[PDB]
Structure 1
Amino acid sequence: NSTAELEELLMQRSLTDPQLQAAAAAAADFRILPDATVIKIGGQSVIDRGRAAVYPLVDEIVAARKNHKLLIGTGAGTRARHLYSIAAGLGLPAGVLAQLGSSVADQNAAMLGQLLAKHGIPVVGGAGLSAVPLSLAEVNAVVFSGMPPYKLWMRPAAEGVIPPYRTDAGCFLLAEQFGCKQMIFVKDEDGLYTANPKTSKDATFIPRISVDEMKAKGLHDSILEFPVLDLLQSAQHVREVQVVNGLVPGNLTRALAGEHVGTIITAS
Protein backbone atom coordinates (compact mmCIF):
# COMPACT_ATOMS: atom_id res chain seq x y z
CA ASN A 1 0.00 0.00 0.00
CA SER A 2 1.89 3.02 -1.34
CA THR A 3 1.79 6.17 0.78
CA ALA A 4 0.24 8.26 -2.01
CA GLU A 5 -2.69 5.84 -1.91
CA LEU A 6 -2.87 5.86 1.89
CA GLU A 7 -2.89 9.66 1.99
CA GLU A 8 -5.49 9.71 -0.80
CA LEU A 9 -7.72 7.44 1.29
CA LEU A 10 -7.06 9.32 4.54
CA MET A 11 -8.57 12.44 2.92
CA GLN A 12 -11.42 11.01 0.81
CA ARG A 13 -12.87 8.15 2.87
CA SER A 14 -14.29 7.53 6.32
CA LEU A 15 -11.90 5.96 8.81
CA THR A 16 -14.32 3.00 8.84
CA ASP A 17 -13.61 2.31 5.15
CA PRO A 18 -11.97 -1.15 4.91
CA GLN A 19 -9.58 -0.01 2.17
CA LEU A 20 -8.26 2.79 4.40
CA GLN A 21 -7.85 0.37 7.31
CA ALA A 22 -5.95 -2.02 5.04
CA ALA A 23 -3.72 0.77 3.72
CA ALA A 24 -2.88 1.90 7.26
CA ALA A 25 -2.10 -1.68 8.32
CA ALA A 26 0.91 -1.66 5.97
CA ALA A 27 2.59 1.29 7.71
CA ALA A 28 6.01 0.94 9.30
CA ASP A 29 6.26 -0.23 12.91
CA PHE A 30 8.22 1.80 15.47
CA ARG A 31 9.01 0.62 19.01
CA ILE A 32 9.36 3.46 21.51
CA LEU A 33 10.96 1.54 24.42
CA PRO A 34 12.20 -1.68 22.77
CA ASP A 35 14.65 -2.57 25.58
CA ALA A 36 12.34 -2.13 28.59
CA THR A 37 10.37 -4.67 30.62
CA VAL A 38 7.01 -3.84 32.21
CA ILE A 39 6.31 -5.48 35.58
CA LYS A 40 3.10 -5.43 37.60
CA ILE A 41 3.39 -5.73 41.39
CA GLY A 42 0.15 -7.14 42.72
CA GLY A 43 -1.96 -5.17 45.17
CA GLN A 44 -3.42 -7.97 47.28
CA SER A 45 -0.84 -10.50 46.07
CA VAL A 46 2.09 -8.48 47.39
CA ILE A 47 1.68 -4.87 48.48
CA ASP A 48 -1.23 -5.47 50.86
CA ARG A 49 0.89 -8.10 52.64
CA GLY A 50 3.37 -5.55 54.02
CA ARG A 51 7.08 -5.64 54.71
CA ALA A 52 7.38 -9.44 54.48
CA ALA A 53 6.51 -9.28 50.77
CA VAL A 54 7.46 -5.73 49.76
CA TYR A 55 10.97 -5.44 51.21
CA PRO A 56 12.39 -8.52 49.41
CA LEU A 57 10.98 -7.29 46.10
CA VAL A 58 12.37 -3.78 46.65
CA ASP A 59 15.77 -5.45 47.07
CA GLU A 60 15.26 -7.52 43.92
CA ILE A 61 14.34 -4.40 41.93
CA VAL A 62 17.34 -2.43 43.19
CA ALA A 63 19.73 -5.19 42.14
CA ALA A 64 17.93 -6.05 38.90
CA ARG A 65 18.08 -2.53 37.44
CA LYS A 66 21.87 -2.88 37.13
CA ASN A 67 21.23 -5.16 34.13
CA HIS A 68 17.56 -4.65 33.16
CA LYS A 69 15.47 -1.60 32.29
CA LEU A 70 12.20 -1.77 34.22
CA LEU A 71 8.82 -0.05 34.27
CA ILE A 72 7.10 -1.13 37.49
CA GLY A 73 3.32 -0.80 37.72
CA THR A 74 1.23 -1.26 40.85
CA GLY A 75 -2.06 -3.02 41.49
CA ALA A 76 -4.90 -1.84 43.71
CA GLY A 77 -6.25 -4.53 46.03
CA THR A 78 -8.21 -4.68 49.26
CA ARG A 79 -9.13 -1.00 49.53
CA ALA A 80 -10.34 -1.02 45.91
CA ARG A 81 -12.62 -4.00 46.54
CA HIS A 82 -14.13 -2.10 49.47
CA LEU A 83 -14.82 0.95 47.29
CA TYR A 84 -16.40 -1.21 44.58
CA SER A 85 -18.68 -2.71 47.24
CA ILE A 86 -19.81 0.68 48.57
CA ALA A 87 -20.36 2.21 45.13
CA ALA A 88 -21.93 -0.92 43.62
CA GLY A 89 -24.40 -1.09 46.50
CA LEU A 90 -25.44 2.48 45.64
CA GLY A 91 -25.99 1.65 41.96
CA LEU A 92 -23.16 3.81 40.62
CA PRO A 93 -21.98 3.04 37.07
CA ALA A 94 -18.75 1.32 36.11
CA GLY A 95 -17.20 4.62 35.03
CA VAL A 96 -17.52 5.98 38.57
CA LEU A 97 -16.05 2.83 40.13
CA ALA A 98 -13.13 3.06 37.70
CA GLN A 99 -12.20 6.47 39.11
CA LEU A 100 -12.27 5.05 42.64
CA GLY A 101 -9.90 2.20 41.77
CA SER A 102 -7.23 4.52 40.37
CA SER A 103 -6.90 6.12 43.81
CA VAL A 104 -5.88 2.78 45.33
CA ALA A 105 -3.26 1.89 42.71
CA ASP A 106 -1.88 5.42 43.04
CA GLN A 107 -1.51 5.00 46.81
CA ASN A 108 0.46 1.78 46.35
CA ALA A 109 2.75 3.43 43.80
CA ALA A 110 3.47 6.23 46.27
CA MET A 111 4.37 3.82 49.09
CA LEU A 112 6.86 2.02 46.84
CA GLY A 113 8.30 5.42 45.96
CA GLN A 114 8.94 6.22 49.62
CA LEU A 115 11.01 3.03 49.83
CA LEU A 116 12.83 3.36 46.48
CA ALA A 117 13.66 7.08 46.63
CA LYS A 118 17.06 6.58 48.28
CA HIS A 119 17.99 4.21 45.42
CA GLY A 120 17.32 6.78 42.68
CA ILE A 121 14.13 5.15 41.36
CA PRO A 122 11.25 7.66 41.11
CA VAL A 123 7.49 7.42 40.95
CA VAL A 124 6.43 9.08 37.71
CA GLY A 125 3.56 9.94 35.43
CA GLY A 126 4.20 9.14 31.80
CA ALA A 127 6.50 6.18 32.38
CA GLY A 128 6.61 5.45 28.65
CA LEU A 129 8.34 8.77 27.90
CA SER A 130 10.38 9.04 31.12
CA ALA A 131 13.48 9.36 28.97
CA VAL A 132 16.00 10.65 31.53
CA PRO A 133 15.60 8.02 34.29
CA LEU A 134 15.49 5.18 31.74
CA SER A 135 18.87 6.20 30.26
CA LEU A 136 20.91 6.48 33.48
CA ALA A 137 22.77 3.57 35.04
CA GLU A 138 22.13 5.23 38.41
CA VAL A 139 18.37 4.85 37.83
CA ASN A 140 17.23 2.71 34.88
CA ALA A 141 13.74 2.13 36.30
CA VAL A 142 10.55 3.97 37.26
CA VAL A 143 7.30 3.27 39.11
CA PHE A 144 3.80 4.08 37.85
CA SER A 145 0.19 3.38 38.78
CA GLY A 146 -1.49 0.41 37.16
CA MET A 147 -5.00 1.63 36.38
CA PRO A 148 -5.76 2.91 32.86
CA PRO A 149 -6.97 6.47 32.16
CA TYR A 150 -10.49 5.64 30.93
CA LYS A 151 -12.14 6.84 34.17
CA LEU A 152 -15.80 7.76 33.50
CA TRP A 153 -15.34 6.65 29.87
CA MET A 154 -14.72 3.05 31.01
CA ARG A 155 -16.49 0.54 28.79
CA PRO A 156 -18.92 -1.43 31.00
CA ALA A 157 -18.84 -5.19 31.15
CA ALA A 158 -21.70 -7.25 29.74
CA GLU A 159 -23.14 -7.57 33.26
CA GLY A 160 -22.32 -5.74 36.48
CA VAL A 161 -20.67 -2.42 37.29
CA ILE A 162 -17.18 -3.72 38.13
CA PRO A 163 -14.76 -2.09 35.63
CA PRO A 164 -13.58 -4.88 33.31
CA TYR A 165 -10.25 -3.20 32.44
CA ARG A 166 -8.15 -2.81 35.59
CA THR A 167 -4.47 -3.05 36.56
CA ASP A 168 -3.64 -6.12 34.45
CA ALA A 169 -4.95 -4.30 31.38
CA GLY A 170 -3.36 -0.98 32.32
CA CYS A 171 0.13 -2.42 32.66
CA PHE A 172 -0.17 -4.67 29.60
CA LEU A 173 -1.34 -1.96 27.20
CA LEU A 174 1.53 0.26 28.33
CA ALA A 175 3.98 -2.49 27.40
CA GLU A 176 2.17 -3.07 24.10
CA GLN A 177 1.92 0.53 22.88
CA PHE A 178 5.54 1.40 23.73
CA GLY A 179 6.82 -1.80 22.11
CA CYS A 180 8.47 -3.20 25.23
CA LYS A 181 10.14 -6.59 24.96
CA GLN A 182 8.64 -8.39 27.97
CA MET A 183 5.60 -8.33 30.27
CA ILE A 184 5.73 -9.98 33.71
CA PHE A 185 2.79 -10.29 36.11
CA VAL A 186 3.87 -10.77 39.74
CA LYS A 187 1.12 -12.55 41.68
CA ASP A 188 1.00 -14.75 44.81
CA GLU A 189 0.68 -18.07 42.93
CA ASP A 190 3.25 -20.10 41.04
CA GLY A 191 1.17 -19.75 37.87
CA LEU A 192 -1.75 -21.28 36.02
CA TYR A 193 -3.27 -24.60 37.08
CA THR A 194 -6.10 -26.78 35.79
CA ALA A 195 -8.18 -25.93 38.87
CA ASN A 196 -7.93 -23.04 41.31
CA PRO A 197 -5.08 -24.00 43.70
CA LYS A 198 -6.65 -21.93 46.49
CA THR A 199 -10.02 -23.73 46.27
CA SER A 200 -9.00 -27.05 44.67
CA LYS A 201 -6.59 -29.71 45.90
CA ASP A 202 -6.09 -31.82 42.75
CA ALA A 203 -4.93 -28.97 40.50
CA THR A 204 -2.19 -29.53 37.92
CA PHE A 205 0.38 -26.87 37.01
CA ILE A 206 0.44 -25.46 33.47
CA PRO A 207 3.87 -24.08 32.42
CA ARG A 208 2.81 -22.91 28.96
CA ILE A 209 -0.50 -22.44 27.14
CA SER A 210 -2.14 -20.31 24.44
CA VAL A 211 -5.12 -17.99 24.78
CA ASP A 212 -7.27 -20.35 22.71
CA GLU A 213 -6.26 -23.31 24.88
CA MET A 214 -7.10 -21.39 28.07
CA LYS A 215 -10.62 -20.59 26.88
CA ALA A 216 -11.26 -24.22 25.91
CA LYS A 217 -10.17 -25.32 29.40
CA GLY A 218 -12.58 -22.80 30.92
CA LEU A 219 -9.60 -20.81 32.22
CA HIS A 220 -10.33 -17.47 30.53
CA ASP A 221 -10.77 -15.67 33.91
CA SER A 222 -8.29 -17.36 36.26
CA ILE A 223 -4.88 -15.82 37.01
CA LEU A 224 -5.34 -12.85 34.65
CA GLU A 225 -8.21 -10.48 33.93
CA PHE A 226 -9.95 -12.18 31.03
CA PRO A 227 -10.16 -9.08 28.76
CA VAL A 228 -6.34 -9.10 28.66
CA LEU A 229 -6.43 -12.42 26.80
CA ASP A 230 -8.27 -10.73 23.93
CA LEU A 231 -5.99 -7.68 24.05
CA LEU A 232 -3.10 -10.15 23.86
CA GLN A 233 -4.38 -11.77 20.66
CA SER A 234 -4.70 -8.31 19.06
CA ALA A 235 -1.30 -7.05 20.24
CA GLN A 236 1.33 -5.88 17.75
CA HIS A 237 4.42 -5.98 19.98
CA VAL A 238 3.84 -8.06 23.15
CA ARG A 239 2.73 -11.48 21.90
CA GLU A 240 3.19 -13.40 25.17
CA VAL A 241 3.15 -12.77 28.92
CA GLN A 242 4.58 -14.45 32.01
CA VAL A 243 2.97 -14.88 35.44
CA VAL A 244 5.27 -15.53 38.40
CA ASN A 245 5.04 -15.80 42.19
CA GLY A 246 6.43 -12.68 43.86
CA LEU A 247 6.55 -14.29 47.31
CA VAL A 248 9.37 -16.61 46.17
CA PRO A 249 12.66 -14.71 46.69
CA GLY A 250 14.49 -14.31 43.40
CA ASN A 251 11.60 -15.37 41.16
CA LEU A 252 11.42 -11.95 39.49
CA THR A 253 15.18 -11.83 38.88
CA ARG A 254 15.21 -15.33 37.37
CA ALA A 255 12.35 -14.40 35.02
CA LEU A 256 14.33 -11.37 33.80
CA ALA A 257 17.24 -13.76 33.11
CA GLY A 258 15.13 -15.97 30.82
CA GLU A 259 14.43 -18.82 33.23
CA HIS A 260 11.07 -20.55 32.71
CA VAL A 261 9.61 -19.90 36.14
CA GLY A 262 5.85 -19.52 36.33
CA THR A 263 3.47 -19.77 33.39
CA ILE A 264 3.82 -18.34 29.87
CA ILE A 265 0.62 -17.40 28.04
CA THR A 266 1.00 -17.02 24.27
CA ALA A 267 -1.31 -15.11 21.94
CA SER A 268 -1.29 -18.01 19.46
Structure 2
Amino acid sequence: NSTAELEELLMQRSLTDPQLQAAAAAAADFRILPDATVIKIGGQSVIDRGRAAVYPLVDEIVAARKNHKLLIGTGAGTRARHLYSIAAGLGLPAGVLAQLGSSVADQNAAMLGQLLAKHGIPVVGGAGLSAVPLSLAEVNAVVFSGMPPYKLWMRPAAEGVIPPYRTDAGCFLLAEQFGCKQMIFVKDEDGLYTANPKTSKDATFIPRISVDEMKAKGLHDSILEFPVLDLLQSAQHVREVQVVNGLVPGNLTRALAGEHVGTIITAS
Protein backbone atom coordinates (compact mmCIF):
# COMPACT_ATOMS: atom_id res chain seq x y z
CA ASN A 1 0.00 0.00 0.00
CA SER A 2 1.33 3.41 -1.04
CA THR A 3 0.22 6.73 -2.51
CA ALA A 4 1.76 5.79 -5.87
CA GLU A 5 -0.25 2.57 -6.16
CA LEU A 6 -3.52 4.34 -5.33
CA GLU A 7 -2.78 6.96 -7.99
CA GLU A 8 -2.02 4.41 -10.72
CA LEU A 9 -5.16 2.44 -9.85
CA LEU A 10 -7.29 5.60 -9.93
CA MET A 11 -6.04 6.46 -13.43
CA GLN A 12 -5.87 3.06 -15.18
CA ARG A 13 -8.72 1.09 -13.58
CA SER A 14 -12.46 1.67 -13.33
CA LEU A 15 -13.91 2.99 -10.08
CA THR A 16 -15.88 -0.27 -9.79
CA ASP A 17 -12.62 -2.24 -9.65
CA PRO A 18 -12.41 -4.16 -6.34
CA GLN A 19 -8.66 -3.51 -6.07
CA LEU A 20 -9.18 0.23 -6.59
CA GLN A 21 -11.87 0.33 -3.89
CA ALA A 22 -9.63 -1.58 -1.48
CA ALA A 23 -6.76 0.85 -2.02
CA ALA A 24 -9.00 3.88 -1.46
CA ALA A 25 -10.25 2.35 1.81
CA ALA A 26 -6.68 2.55 3.18
CA ALA A 27 -6.52 6.34 2.79
CA ALA A 28 -6.26 8.61 5.81
CA ASP A 29 -9.43 9.70 7.61
CA PHE A 30 -9.90 13.41 8.31
CA ARG A 31 -12.80 14.67 10.42
CA ILE A 32 -14.02 18.10 9.34
CA LEU A 33 -15.90 18.96 12.57
CA PRO A 34 -14.74 16.36 15.10
CA ASP A 35 -15.86 18.26 18.22
CA ALA A 36 -19.42 19.01 17.06
CA THR A 37 -22.70 17.25 17.84
CA VAL A 38 -25.60 16.85 15.41
CA ILE A 39 -29.07 17.06 16.96
CA LYS A 40 -32.38 16.43 15.20
CA ILE A 41 -35.46 18.21 16.55
CA GLY A 42 -38.40 16.07 15.50
CA GLY A 43 -41.05 17.76 13.39
CA GLN A 44 -44.15 15.77 14.26
CA SER A 45 -42.77 14.74 17.66
CA VAL A 46 -41.66 18.19 18.89
CA ILE A 47 -42.07 21.28 16.71
CA ASP A 48 -45.66 20.49 15.69
CA ARG A 49 -46.55 20.53 19.42
CA GLY A 50 -46.00 24.28 19.79
CA ARG A 51 -44.47 26.26 22.62
CA ALA A 52 -44.99 23.63 25.33
CA ALA A 53 -42.36 21.46 23.60
CA VAL A 54 -40.25 23.98 21.66
CA TYR A 55 -39.66 26.61 24.36
CA PRO A 56 -37.93 24.28 26.88
CA LEU A 57 -35.73 22.91 24.09
CA VAL A 58 -34.78 26.44 23.02
CA ASP A 59 -33.66 27.01 26.61
CA GLU A 60 -31.59 23.82 26.61
CA ILE A 61 -29.95 24.75 23.30
CA VAL A 62 -29.01 28.23 24.56
CA ALA A 63 -27.67 26.72 27.79
CA ALA A 64 -25.83 23.75 26.28
CA ARG A 65 -24.09 25.69 23.49
CA LYS A 66 -21.81 27.26 26.12
CA ASN A 67 -19.99 23.91 26.35
CA HIS A 68 -20.87 22.16 23.07
CA LYS A 69 -20.79 22.82 19.33
CA LEU A 70 -24.27 22.01 18.00
CA LEU A 71 -25.59 21.33 14.51
CA ILE A 72 -29.37 21.47 14.95
CA GLY A 73 -31.46 19.83 12.21
CA THR A 74 -35.24 20.04 11.97
CA GLY A 75 -37.81 17.43 10.98
CA ALA A 76 -40.88 17.89 8.84
CA GLY A 77 -44.09 16.65 10.45
CA THR A 78 -47.79 16.57 9.73
CA ARG A 79 -47.61 19.17 6.94
CA ALA A 80 -45.24 16.87 5.06
CA ARG A 81 -47.55 13.91 5.66
CA HIS A 82 -50.36 15.99 4.17
CA LEU A 83 -48.22 16.82 1.13
CA TYR A 84 -47.19 13.17 0.78
CA SER A 85 -50.84 12.09 0.89
CA ILE A 86 -51.95 14.62 -1.75
CA ALA A 87 -49.05 13.77 -4.08
CA ALA A 88 -49.22 9.99 -3.59
CA GLY A 89 -52.91 10.03 -4.52
CA LEU A 90 -51.86 11.70 -7.77
CA GLY A 91 -49.22 9.07 -8.51
CA LEU A 92 -46.30 11.46 -8.18
CA PRO A 93 -42.88 9.79 -7.83
CA ALA A 94 -40.66 9.82 -4.76
CA GLY A 95 -38.41 12.48 -6.28
CA VAL A 96 -41.28 14.98 -6.26
CA LEU A 97 -42.37 14.00 -2.74
CA ALA A 98 -38.79 14.67 -1.60
CA GLN A 99 -38.95 18.29 -2.80
CA LEU A 100 -42.26 18.85 -1.01
CA GLY A 101 -40.89 17.42 2.23
CA SER A 102 -37.86 19.72 2.10
CA SER A 103 -40.04 22.84 2.25
CA VAL A 104 -41.77 21.69 5.45
CA ALA A 105 -38.40 21.00 7.08
CA ASP A 106 -37.33 24.45 5.85
CA GLN A 107 -40.42 25.89 7.57
CA ASN A 108 -39.50 24.32 10.91
CA ALA A 109 -35.90 25.53 10.58
CA ALA A 110 -37.24 29.07 10.15
CA MET A 111 -39.46 28.98 13.24
CA LEU A 112 -36.73 27.46 15.41
CA GLY A 113 -34.12 29.88 14.07
CA GLN A 114 -36.26 32.95 14.81
CA LEU A 115 -36.59 31.90 18.45
CA LEU A 116 -32.79 31.60 18.68
CA ALA A 117 -31.86 34.68 16.61
CA LYS A 118 -31.40 37.00 19.59
CA HIS A 119 -28.80 34.52 20.90
CA GLY A 120 -26.81 34.92 17.68
CA ILE A 121 -27.65 31.46 16.31
CA PRO A 122 -28.31 31.56 12.54
CA VAL A 123 -30.18 29.29 10.10
CA VAL A 124 -27.91 27.63 7.50
CA GLY A 125 -30.50 28.38 4.83
CA GLY A 126 -28.34 30.20 2.29
CA ALA A 127 -24.97 28.41 1.75
CA GLY A 128 -24.25 24.93 3.20
CA LEU A 129 -21.01 25.48 5.15
CA SER A 130 -18.71 28.45 5.87
CA ALA A 131 -21.88 29.66 7.31
CA VAL A 132 -21.32 26.63 9.57
CA PRO A 133 -17.57 26.95 10.40
CA LEU A 134 -17.88 30.67 11.21
CA SER A 135 -21.01 30.25 13.33
CA LEU A 136 -19.78 27.16 15.18
CA ALA A 137 -16.60 29.04 16.08
CA GLU A 138 -18.27 32.25 17.27
CA VAL A 139 -21.81 31.31 18.41
CA ASN A 140 -21.41 27.49 18.85
CA ALA A 141 -24.65 26.47 17.10
CA VAL A 142 -26.45 26.53 13.76
CA VAL A 143 -29.94 25.53 12.64
CA PHE A 144 -30.43 23.66 9.36
CA SER A 145 -33.10 21.66 7.55
CA GLY A 146 -32.84 17.92 8.09
CA MET A 147 -34.08 16.88 4.66
CA PRO A 148 -31.42 15.50 2.28
CA PRO A 149 -30.87 17.48 -0.93
CA TYR A 150 -31.60 14.55 -3.25
CA LYS A 151 -34.80 16.19 -4.57
CA LEU A 152 -35.78 14.49 -7.87
CA TRP A 153 -32.73 12.19 -7.58
CA MET A 154 -34.18 10.63 -4.41
CA ARG A 155 -33.44 6.92 -4.17
CA PRO A 156 -36.94 5.38 -4.02
CA ALA A 157 -38.02 2.64 -1.65
CA ALA A 158 -38.72 -0.91 -2.84
CA GLU A 159 -42.41 -0.02 -3.15
CA GLY A 160 -44.48 3.10 -2.62
CA VAL A 161 -43.68 6.72 -3.41
CA ILE A 162 -42.85 7.91 0.12
CA PRO A 163 -39.16 8.97 0.23
CA PRO A 164 -37.23 6.45 2.35
CA TYR A 165 -34.46 8.96 3.19
CA ARG A 166 -35.98 11.85 5.14
CA THR A 167 -34.97 14.04 8.07
CA ASP A 168 -33.54 11.21 10.19
CA ALA A 169 -31.25 10.13 7.35
CA GLY A 170 -30.39 13.70 6.36
CA CYS A 171 -29.19 14.60 9.86
CA PHE A 172 -27.26 11.35 10.30
CA LEU A 173 -25.54 11.63 6.91
CA LEU A 174 -24.39 15.14 7.79
CA ALA A 175 -23.02 13.83 11.10
CA GLU A 176 -21.18 10.99 9.37
CA GLN A 177 -19.66 13.03 6.54
CA PHE A 178 -18.50 15.83 8.87
CA GLY A 179 -17.00 13.31 11.30
CA CYS A 180 -18.96 14.63 14.27
CA LYS A 181 -18.53 12.96 17.65
CA GLN A 182 -22.20 12.45 18.52
CA MET A 183 -25.67 12.12 16.97
CA ILE A 184 -28.83 12.64 19.05
CA PHE A 185 -32.39 12.19 17.76
CA VAL A 186 -34.86 14.23 19.83
CA LYS A 187 -38.29 12.60 19.62
CA ASP A 188 -41.42 12.40 21.81
CA GLU A 189 -40.68 8.93 23.24
CA ASP A 190 -38.30 7.81 25.97
CA GLY A 191 -36.58 5.52 23.47
CA LEU A 192 -36.92 2.15 21.79
CA TYR A 193 -39.36 -0.45 23.12
CA THR A 194 -40.09 -4.05 22.20
CA ALA A 195 -43.29 -2.67 20.63
CA ASN A 196 -44.90 0.66 19.77
CA PRO A 197 -45.69 2.21 23.18
CA LYS A 198 -48.50 4.37 21.77
CA THR A 199 -50.50 1.36 20.51
CA SER A 200 -49.21 -1.45 22.75
CA LYS A 201 -50.27 -2.20 26.31
CA ASP A 202 -47.16 -4.19 27.37
CA ALA A 203 -43.91 -2.97 25.79
CA THR A 204 -40.44 -3.09 27.34
CA PHE A 205 -37.88 -0.29 27.23
CA ILE A 206 -34.55 -1.08 25.55
CA PRO A 207 -31.60 0.93 26.94
CA ARG A 208 -29.02 -0.29 24.40
CA ILE A 209 -29.19 -2.43 21.26
CA SER A 210 -27.29 -3.00 18.02
CA VAL A 211 -28.68 -2.84 14.49
CA ASP A 212 -28.37 -6.60 14.01
CA GLU A 213 -30.35 -7.22 17.20
CA MET A 214 -33.08 -4.80 16.07
CA LYS A 215 -33.50 -6.57 12.72
CA ALA A 216 -33.70 -9.96 14.45
CA LYS A 217 -36.76 -8.78 16.44
CA GLY A 218 -38.78 -6.80 13.88
CA LEU A 219 -37.87 -3.27 15.04
CA HIS A 220 -36.33 -2.10 11.76
CA ASP A 221 -38.82 0.70 11.00
CA SER A 222 -39.92 1.89 14.45
CA ILE A 223 -38.57 4.96 16.23
CA LEU A 224 -36.00 5.63 13.48
CA GLU A 225 -36.31 5.53 9.71
CA PHE A 226 -35.29 2.04 8.66
CA PRO A 227 -32.59 3.13 6.13
CA VAL A 228 -30.83 5.02 8.95
CA LEU A 229 -30.00 1.68 10.56
CA ASP A 230 -28.36 0.46 7.35
CA LEU A 231 -26.45 3.73 6.94
CA LEU A 232 -25.32 3.37 10.56
CA GLN A 233 -23.82 -0.07 9.88
CA SER A 234 -21.83 1.38 6.96
CA ALA A 235 -20.63 4.50 8.78
CA GLN A 236 -16.97 5.11 9.62
CA HIS A 237 -17.21 8.10 12.00
CA VAL A 238 -20.57 7.92 13.81
CA ARG A 239 -20.86 4.30 14.95
CA GLU A 240 -23.73 4.85 17.41
CA VAL A 241 -26.72 7.15 17.91
CA GLN A 242 -28.90 8.11 20.87
CA VAL A 243 -32.69 8.58 20.87
CA VAL A 244 -34.09 10.78 23.65
CA ASN A 245 -37.46 12.24 24.67
CA GLY A 246 -37.47 15.98 24.02
CA LEU A 247 -40.67 16.45 26.04
CA VAL A 248 -38.77 15.65 29.26
CA PRO A 249 -37.14 18.79 30.72
CA GLY A 250 -33.36 18.71 30.50
CA ASN A 251 -33.11 15.48 28.50
CA LEU A 252 -31.14 17.10 25.66
CA THR A 253 -28.86 18.86 28.15
CA ARG A 254 -28.15 15.63 30.04
CA ALA A 255 -27.60 13.65 26.83
CA LEU A 256 -25.00 16.22 25.75
CA ALA A 257 -23.34 15.81 29.18
CA GLY A 258 -22.73 12.11 28.47
CA GLU A 259 -25.71 10.69 30.37
CA HIS A 260 -27.25 7.50 28.99
CA VAL A 261 -30.82 8.75 28.78
CA GLY A 262 -33.00 7.10 26.17
CA THR A 263 -31.78 4.37 23.82
CA ILE A 264 -28.29 4.01 22.36
CA ILE A 265 -28.26 2.17 19.02
CA THR A 266 -24.88 0.77 17.95
CA ALA A 267 -23.74 -0.23 14.47
CA SER A 268 -22.34 -3.56 15.67
Q: Percent identity?
A: 100
User: Structure 1 stretch 137-146 or stretch 8-17: which is displaced more?
Assistant: 137-146
Aligned residue for 1:38, secondary structure, equals strand
Give the 3 Å change call, closer, same or farther, for CA 53–127 of structure 1 in structure 2: farther
Indicate conservation of the 8 Å contact 2:42/2:186, yes or no: yes
- Summarize the Cα distance change of 1:222–1:265 in structure 2 as closer, same or farther, 3 Å threshold: same
Give the number of aligned pairs: 268
Q: Deviations over 1:1-55 (max 9, x none)?
A: 2111110011100000111001101000000000000000000100000010001
Equivalent-residue separation in structure 2 for 1:25 and 1:69 (angstroms): 29
Partner SS state of residue 96, structure 1: helix
User: Once the 2 structures are TM-superposed, how far is the Cα of residue 128 of structure 1 from its aligned partner?
Assistant: 6.7
Q: Equivalents in 1 of 2:131, 2:91: separation in Å?
A: 42
TM-superposed CA distance for 1:201, in Å, is 1.1
Q: Quote how far apart the aligned CAs of 1:114 are.
A: 1.0
1:143 match: secondary structure: strand
Deviations 1:164-204 (A, max 9, x none): 00000000000000000000000000000001100001000
**TM-score w.r.t. structure 2 length?**
0.97
C-alpha offsets along residues 76-95 of structure 1, whole Å, 9 cap, x if unaligned? 00000000000000000000
Residue 218 of structure 1 is matched in structure 2 by 218
Question: 4+ residue stretches of structure 1 with deviation over 4 A?
Answer: 131-138
TM superposition shift of 1:130: 3.5
Is the CA contact (8 Å cut-off) linking 2:35 and 2:69 kept in structure 1? yes
Return closer, same or farther for 1:131/1:79 CA change in 2, 3 Å cut-off: closer
What per-residue deviation string (whole Å, max 9, x for no partner) do you get for residues 125-153 of structure 1?
47873467656675110000000000000
Change (3 A) 1:220 1:81: same
Q: 8 Å contact 1:181–1:238 — kept in the other structure?
A: yes
Evaluate the alpha carbon distance shift between residue 110 and residue 131 of structure 1 in structure 2; reply closer, same or farther with a 3 A threshold. Answer: closer
Cα distance in structure 2, aligned partners of 1:210 and 1:43: 25
Residue in 2 that maps onto 1:191: 191
For residue 264 of structure 2, give the secondary structure of its aligned residue in structure 1: strand
Mapping for residues 233-248 of structure 1, pairs under 5 Å: 233-248=233-248
Q: Distance between the aligned counterparts of 2:128 and 2:64, measured in 1?
A: 19
Q: Is the 8 A contact 1:133 1:139 kept in 2?
A: no
Would you say the 8 A contact 1:127–1:143 is kept in 2? no
Across the aligned residues of Structure 1 and Structure 2, the Cα RMSD in angstroms comes to 1.4
SS at match of 1:40: strand
In the alignment, is the contact (CA less than 8 A) between 2:34 and 2:180 conserved in 1? yes
Long gaps (5+) in structure 2: none
Alignment of 1:146-185 (within 5 A): 146-185=146-185
